[PDB]
Design a protein around this ligand. Sequence first.
Ligand SMILES: CC1=C(O)/C(=C\[NH+]=C(/CN2CCc3ccccc32)C(=O)O)C(COP(=O)(O)O)=CN1
Ligand SMILES: CC1=C(O)/C(=C\[NH+]=C(/CN2CCc3ccccc32)C(=O)O)C(COP(=O)(O)O)=CN1
Ligand SMILES: O=P(O)(O)OCCNS(=O)(=O)c1ccc(OC(F)(F)F)cc1
Ligand SMILES: O=P(O)(O)OCCNS(=O)(=O)c1ccc(OC(F)(F)F)cc1
Ligand SMILES: [Cs+]
Ligand SMILES: [Cs+]
Ligand SMILES: [Cs+]
Ligand SMILES: [Cs+]
Ligand SMILES: [Cs+]
Lengths: 391, 391, 266, 266
Amino acid sequence: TLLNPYFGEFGGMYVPQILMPALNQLEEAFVSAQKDPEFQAQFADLLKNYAGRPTALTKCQNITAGTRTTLYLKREDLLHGGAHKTNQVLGQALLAKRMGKSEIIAETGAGQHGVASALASALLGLKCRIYMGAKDVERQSPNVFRMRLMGAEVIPVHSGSATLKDACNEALRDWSGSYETAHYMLGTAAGPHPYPTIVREFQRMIGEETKAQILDKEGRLPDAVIACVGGGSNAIGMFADFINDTSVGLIGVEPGGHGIETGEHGAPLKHGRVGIYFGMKAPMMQTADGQIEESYSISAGLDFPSVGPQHAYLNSIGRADYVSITDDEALEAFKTLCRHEGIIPALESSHALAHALKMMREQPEKEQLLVVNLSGRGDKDIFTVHDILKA
Amino acid sequence: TLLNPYFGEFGGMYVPQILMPALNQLEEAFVSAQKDPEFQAQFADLLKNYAGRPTALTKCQNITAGTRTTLYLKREDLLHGGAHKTNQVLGQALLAKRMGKSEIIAETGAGQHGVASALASALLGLKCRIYMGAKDVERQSPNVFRMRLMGAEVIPVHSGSATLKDACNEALRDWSGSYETAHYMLGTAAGPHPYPTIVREFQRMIGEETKAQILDKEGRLPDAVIACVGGGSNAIGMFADFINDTSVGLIGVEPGGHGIETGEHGAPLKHGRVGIYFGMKAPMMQTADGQIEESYSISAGLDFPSVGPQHAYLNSIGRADYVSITDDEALEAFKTLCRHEGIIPALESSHALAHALKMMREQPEKEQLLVVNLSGRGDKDIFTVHDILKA
Amino acid sequence: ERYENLFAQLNDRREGAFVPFVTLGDPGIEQSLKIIDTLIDAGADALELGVPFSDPLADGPTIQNANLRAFAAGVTPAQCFEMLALIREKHPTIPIGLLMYANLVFNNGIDAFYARCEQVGVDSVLVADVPVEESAPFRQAALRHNIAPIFICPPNADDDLLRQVASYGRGYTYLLSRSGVTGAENRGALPLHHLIEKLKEYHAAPALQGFGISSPEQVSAAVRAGAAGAISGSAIVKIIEKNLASPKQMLAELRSFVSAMKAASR
Amino acid sequence: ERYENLFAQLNDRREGAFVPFVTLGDPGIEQSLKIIDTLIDAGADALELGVPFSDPLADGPTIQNANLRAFAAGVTPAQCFEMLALIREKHPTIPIGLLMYANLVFNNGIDAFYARCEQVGVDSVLVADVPVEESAPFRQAALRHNIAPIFICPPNADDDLLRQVASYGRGYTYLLSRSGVTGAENRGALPLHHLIEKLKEYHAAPALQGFGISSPEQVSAAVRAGAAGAISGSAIVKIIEKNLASPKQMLAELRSFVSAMKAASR
Ligand SMILES: CC1=C(O)/C(=C\[NH+]=C(/CN2CCc3ccccc32)C(=O)O)C(COP(=O)(O)O)=CN1
Ligand SMILES: CC1=C(O)/C(=C\[NH+]=C(/CN2CCc3ccccc32)C(=O)O)C(COP(=O)(O)O)=CN1
Ligand SMILES: O=P(O)(O)OCCNS(=O)(=O)c1ccc(OC(F)(F)F)cc1
Ligand SMILES: O=P(O)(O)OCCNS(=O)(=O)c1ccc(OC(F)(F)F)cc1
Ligand SMILES: [Cs+]
Ligand SMILES: [Cs+]
Ligand SMILES: [Cs+]
Ligand SMILES: [Cs+]
Ligand SMILES: [Cs+]
């Protein structure tokens, strides 16, 4: 390989032999594109003029009132498509074209990556095929028909938990038979190398902009940046540019679901065990026997029984810290942002916000400057949240 | 009055005597705020850091392929809240605070102004009360619960056509009894002076940014700027900075509904007759007897039997031209943008796009540089559009 | 003129005016004409009459529904003028005022509208959505056709407005009981003595109080405060809607009420 | 060793191997053991056996459902090793290969897994999601416990891969019929002669063709092309699922098929 597939013990390329050429082709295309000024210009142009970068960094003064916490929100909810997923999808689509692929296979849970895949494919002339768990088709329905309006085929997956893991499995199976014409647009910083690396580099502008914006507004770096962790893309996009700024805490937030003690959660980094699946060596939720467990979250986007290898590594060395937030804590944060800042956050992003609000409330006289990655908007979640209100 | 309430013959302050002090107070507050560097800085800060200005100007290369038309879209769909409505709502909310008001009355049709009113009120500490026609509650439902999540009271109006006009009537009646504590946040560039003037000045950044962005990308001004016209706010926001650039065509697009000849339309500027209602002298759809007619559009946001006085004036002098686009033409444009640019536009904005696509297709070898105001995103319209597809 | 003679005579009998309001053609042309006859017979000193409008922005649900009923009976402005001619033909001296919205006046030309009012024997016109600020072409057309233009004195009125209303108005000055829209359920509580006194100082046309007056005690209070009379709309109209099934029992219940209201003005 | 003796004997009788695949414990421990006995009796030269895994990323619906049935019967990896012991105890010479996914091997330690394979008498292990690039700890553990590590030669294989597979592999080389996942419905059509010849040149372990082989004609084609044998999975498993109601009629239909497939290898 051209690049290191591992982050400490975590990562690698644990795919069938048939798929290694595709992975090698992708790696070579990426390394080449990174050195290509024309690629970089085309990518920059789509991000700025199509997706609407740079996104805002909003100071939330109402929600921190009466405390010594200053909170900013990095507004990826304002990105075209409604989430940070759009960033790296535009980059991967350009790599797909560079590799002469005409088709796109993707998987989606919250439907935000699926929307992103569909819009990029519509824009750049690719045929897009999307796997989504049938439970997620229901609970994240507005996204299902956004995808279909933009010319994408949406394929409901009924097997297993009928959520994200099962969508991934189907997408992987499809790709192993169609890699010659189809690029697999993996939607997070996980899976086989080179995906964890590529997804980080194409999400890295989140942290770079945040750094420039916070220095401009505050004259210094944040005490901590805080992001939810599904597979790890929005978090690593935020974290990446701060990794060498040792004074800046990096907090990743896994879904605690109904509570860690119930086993109905999606927190394998802190509560799972290293395993091999999804093409990588990474923490997973697994039985004693080594079968992969089903995860659970109120949010479809965090409902995944593994995590990307770089977060597993940053945790092990102590550089980043990971915590969990329950369904109920995420819901309170959702309601709080709606009512006091007039922003409706995705339920995924609400986990990140919830933890920030905990840091504030637990120690209200601690002076802290925090940034939360608001990875998406919550329009897709409004029916779900409505139905829970009542009871 | 401090400012001229008329644009030629159109405009004025045709409200009950009781409401004149409120109108005079608002006018004085606006004139004062316009000269206040602190107001302007606070307004600029909310627009940039909260709402996400400047918005992108996107070149659409796929949809113009094989023609000599170059088309840009001003991306107000990327503004926080999902539409241009957010701009002037932030300004009016700041005026409400400056006048010591604690409450907000608003009306909404597409629900985008209602969402905007609710979010601004949540952010700035105001109690928000919103009138919406019961038909619009149904056809623009995602917006109904966005409003309610942010702490706003949503009041369904069943009388009359149960659409926008009827929402306005109720809001007006409410305001005439509560003007002492409540600011009436009128949602368009229509109604009694000073509203047509204030709404323009607080939407004016649309055209100012467009001008700067097009000069940067093209080195010259557009041949025409094109905007849909409900009451006139997004169009006048786009038009305003170009009014003195005589080479730049200004095209406003009214909804043609089922067809002008069916009488089921919302195009009083070109197909109505001057009347007095909604606090203004303006073109309206009215019976021979002078009763106000019910309008019709597939889009709730254009479904209004009048138009703002400044557009009526710009038309009369020949400075701006107004046309209509039918339900079916707006739907084709909606589908076209989704599939070929990966942007899902509001059905209101789709009228503007439809007319631009007509200018292109009717004369495919005419060299023209056009800007369409993409006033909002179409997430609110996806269920409606789905249901029409089938038949 | 008819107003002048009315207030002159009322002054001599030392009493206030009771001026009911109804919508022309509610619930039908014929029943409305009978309702109005019952109103005059029961003691109405003058009349305030609404022409059905599609969008009555100053009216609450009661009078809104009055407009709707008239529209169900297919009542047009042309039929309203025909009714007015019949009312004047039966009652030569009673002052007749119209409550108009601006579009119905502006529709076929402001001048032509007031010319038509004169022709049928109307005494005054109040245009609800025309404040003094927009009143010029309306008040000029009124005076040219010997129509009293009615101006509103609101509770939030300042001295500049008081003097405007006093010079521009004829017939009577409308003294508003409260902010808001028409409605019997909502009564105006604020004292209006200081406004009544200043209108008299600038020699405004005599004042009639309206909005929310639904009881004889309110009429009595208005006159005792110095106002020349009182106007009741929604209270009257509620009797029409609650007795739609009973046309004869409608007129009896209307008669009782108007008598009781007029008595209070004495 | 058992593979070496098998290919040696097959060479002397001038025929190819027929190697069926089933999921251990599908549809239950006891019926599976009877199914496997029927397979060997009907003419299976070796066996390829899957341990039920929650997420079989290289398998289509047929074998997916095979895994599900085994899971419904509550089949664990521990029970699979118990079955393997019983199979070896009844059949001392037949080569036994396991189809593994990496997590089941890595779970309790890679070394311990192969030590356990040796202990029960397994001859080879193929880990489906470990390419040569990640194979080192797996192939080292295999060789330490006298287990053949099985490597895949795909159709898209280049010369560098051919030489890797040839030196690292033991027992047999898995020659892939096509891209995609396991499935009888999808047959591999591309000619594989040039890959078969090059493996022989670099002295790879004898080649077995697998994926999509569901008919005697396909077996015959594979051997005539130079491959040492053929593997059939989904075809066998379809007979299990279509005859779940009929255990005796299952074994008869299994017997017919395996005989017909083995005949084609002659
Ligand atoms: C607004 C928001 C999301 O939508 C989201 C996720 N969404 C998915 C699931 N995606 C698609 C393939 C995938 C595999 C594993 C995990 C997540 C995802 C989607 O399909 O919209 C995440 C969390 O994702 P991370 O940033 O950690 O990558 C945060 N915020
Ligand atoms: C995305 C978009 C809209 O949402 C929209 C309108 N929306 C309404 C109706 N608004 C609220 C009060 C009102 C009164 C009259 C006409 C319109 C409106 C709303 O309540 O979201 C218009 C058209 O509006 P104009 O830009 O011409 O002002 C264009 N684009
Ligand atoms: O008894 P209520 O509360 O129904 O009041 C009845 C009033 N009917 S009216 O014609 O005098 C009348 C008078 C003025 C109106 O509007 C304005 F004040 F803005 F000009 C509306 C109705
Ligand atoms: O007849 P079919 O199509 O069901 O094929 C049966 C195959 N069963 S198997 O155990 O050899 C087998 C071999 C290799 C596999 O994956 C890998 F190639 F990626 F390694 C999967 C299954
Ligand atoms: Cs921006
Ligand atoms: Cs604070
Ligand atoms: Cs997770
Ligand atoms: Cs073009
Ligand atoms: Cs309109």
